[PDB]
Amino acid sequence: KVFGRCELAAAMKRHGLDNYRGYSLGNWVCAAKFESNFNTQATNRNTDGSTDYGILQINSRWWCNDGRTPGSRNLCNIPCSALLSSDITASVNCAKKIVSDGNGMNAWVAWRNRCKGTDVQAWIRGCRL
Ligand SMILES: CC(=O)N[C@@H]1[C@@H](O)[C@H](O[C@@H]2O[C@H](CO)[C@@H](O[C@@H]3O[C@H](CO)[C@@H](O)[C@H](O)[C@H]3NC(C)=O)[C@H](O)[C@H]2NC(C)=O)[C@@H](CO)O[C@H]1O
Ligand SMILES: [Cl-]
Ligand SMILES: [Cl-]
Ligand code: NA
Numbered sequence: 001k002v003f004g005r006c007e008l009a010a011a012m013k014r015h016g017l018d019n020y021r022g023y024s025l026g027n028w029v030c031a032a033k034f035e036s037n038f039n040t041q042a043t044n045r046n047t048d049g050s051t052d053y054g055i056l057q058i059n060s061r062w063w064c065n066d067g068r069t070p071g072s073r074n075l076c077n078i079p080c081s082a083l084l085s086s087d088i089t090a091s092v093n094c095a096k097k098i099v100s101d102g103n104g105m106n107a108w109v110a111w112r113n114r115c116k117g118t119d120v121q122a123w124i125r126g127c128r129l
Contacts, residue, residue, distance in 0.1 A: 001086035003038040006127035015092040021099045026120030034110035041084050054083030054091045
């Protein structure tokens, strides 16, 4: 599923991401935009053999099991394919654990390089929230 911008904003708010660990909703929408282009089915292989999955590009070295990332963990206790669903529940629940793990939203490379320190509120302009 390719979400609309305000559609995804509404979904993340309902699932409790707006100001989760202090990160306003626009941060999460900006992260999703540049990680996946709002596409729940996005996948991308990394040089270390791991793969990033879903709307928030959650990585199989740490967070989910995809059966092909040796020596990895599965800290969200979830198959990585669950992160590709049109229902973003699994991705949001896992994202809450990632952002709580010490480095905040710096765990998302695209967030650090393209959202951090910008006017992220613009990502929820015009949305009925
Ligand atoms: C969205 C996503 O999947 N991002 C991936 C990053 O999570 C991952 O970075 C590494 O993440 C782990 C887990 O959070 C980091 O380990 C944690 O480090 C903190 C700070 O030192 C420490 O307090 C925690 O105890 C420790 N947790 C565990 C379970 O060990 C690790 O430092 C990150 N590595 C970095 C930032 O280089 C990166 C790299 O695999 O991939 C992203 O896609
Ligand atoms: Cl915001
Ligand atoms: Cl933080
Ligand atoms: Na894994």
